[PDB]
Structures are given as structure tokens and as C-alpha cells.
């Protein structure tokens, strides 16, 4: 199938019509998405098949065809861009200054932007175009608004 680097939609024909359940990044022959989008199931790309290679429910990440390749990190100071890919709408870059998720195991960058459920897996980029994490796993704060972590995997 198609293995060109870039952002892709994750679709399903199981429900009514064709439904977008999430998004992912193709880089160096490996497809990267969030675990809650596919639940680790196999993916199709035209006539080709993509099998899961690594995944972890707690990190909420999965890679297909090879190991996790994305290793860029937020610098803790600069604005970043969410390359949002919403269901049935064109890819759009939204610029923001991330906040912080403070945990017992350290600090994580966070993006205060709300998009439909099927937008999970959209890449968050630095000014160099490098993917510093994926959008789609976070929390609903006091005023009912959504805040996502900037979720990044480990490159072995």
C-alpha cells in the first residue's frame, strides 16, 4: 500500500457509512497512532496489510511495521502546532503555547484544544516540522473543556 511519510486518517466501514476513528503518522516505513484508536487491530492500506509491532495501553501508543520512530521533544518554552485532521474536514495547522501536566513521575506538555473524538492521533509539531507527540489522550478540566497531553513514545 501507500507508505509515503505524512499524516493519515484511520477509517472503518464497520459502522454506518465510512467513519473516521482516528489519525496517525507514517515515518520511516512505520505507522504511529494512539492505542485507543485501533485497540491494536491490523490495518489496511489499499491492498497491503499493516500489522502491529509495539504497543502499550498505559502510554496509549501503538506502532505498525516496525518500532516507534518519533523521538523529538517539546523544548518547554516555544509555541507548537497541532496538525489537526478532523473527520470529513481538511488537514489544518493550529498554533498554541502548551501548558503542563504535572505528575508524580514528571512534567508533560499539554495542548488546550478541543476536537472531535476521531481526531486522536493527530501529530503535534515543533518549528522544524518534527513530530514531538500525538494528540488525543488527556482530561476534561473544571469548565468542561478538553486538554490533551503531548504524548511521545520512546525510540529504542
Amino acid at each position: 500500500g501507500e507508505t509515503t511519510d505524512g499524516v493519515y486518517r484511520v477509517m472503518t466501514r464497520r459502522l454506518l457509512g465510512s467513519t473516521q476513528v482516528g489519525v496517525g503518522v507514517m515515518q520511516e516505513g512505520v505507522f504511529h497512532t494512539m492505542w485507543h484508536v485501533t485497540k491494536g487491530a491490523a490495518l489496511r492500506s489499499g491492498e497491503g496489510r499493516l500489522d502491529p509491532y509495539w504497543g502499550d495501553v498505559k502510554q496509549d501508543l501503538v506502532s505498525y511495521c516496525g518500532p516507534w520512530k518519533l523521538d523529538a521533544a517539546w523544548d518547554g518554552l516555544s509555541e507548537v502546532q497541532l496538525l489537526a485532521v478532523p473527520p470529513g474536514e481538511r488537514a489544518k495547522n493550529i498554533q498554541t503555547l502548551p501548558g503542563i501536566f504535572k505528575t508524580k513521575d514528571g512534567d508533560i506538555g499539554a495542548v488546550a484544544l478541543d476536537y472531535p473524538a476521531g481526531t486522536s492521533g493527530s501529530p503535534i509539531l515543533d518549528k522544524c516540522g518534527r513530530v514531538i507527540g500525538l494528540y488525543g489522550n488527556g482530561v476534561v478540566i473544571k469548565n468542561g473543556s478538553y486538554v490533551s497531553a503531548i504524548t511521545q513514545g520512546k525510540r529504542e
Binding site: Y8, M11, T12, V57, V85, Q95, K127
Partner: protein, 39 residues
């Protein structure tokens, strides 16, 4: 069966729409990958 469709290149767009705030939150992460607010 799930399938993928290309949606674009991964590139920084100069003069993109600038929005969203920067909240500093105390959070917990459980074994199931769910984030929650610590209060």
C-alpha cells in the same frame, strides 16, 4: 477492518491560526492510560 488514507504532509505552517491557552494542571495517570485531575 480498519484502513488508512493519506491526509497530507507534516509541515509547520507560517502564519497559522494561533489559539488555545497554557493550563498548568496536577494530574494522575492510571494503569489503563486514563488521565485524571489531582485535587
Amino acid at each position: 477492518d480498519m484502513y488508512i488514507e493519506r491526509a497530507g504532509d507534516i509541515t509547520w505552517e507560517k502564519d497559522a491560526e494561533v489559539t488555545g491557552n497554557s493550563p498548568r494542571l496536577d494530574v494522575a495517570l492510571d494503569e489503563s492510560g486514563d488521565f485524571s485531575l489531582v485535587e
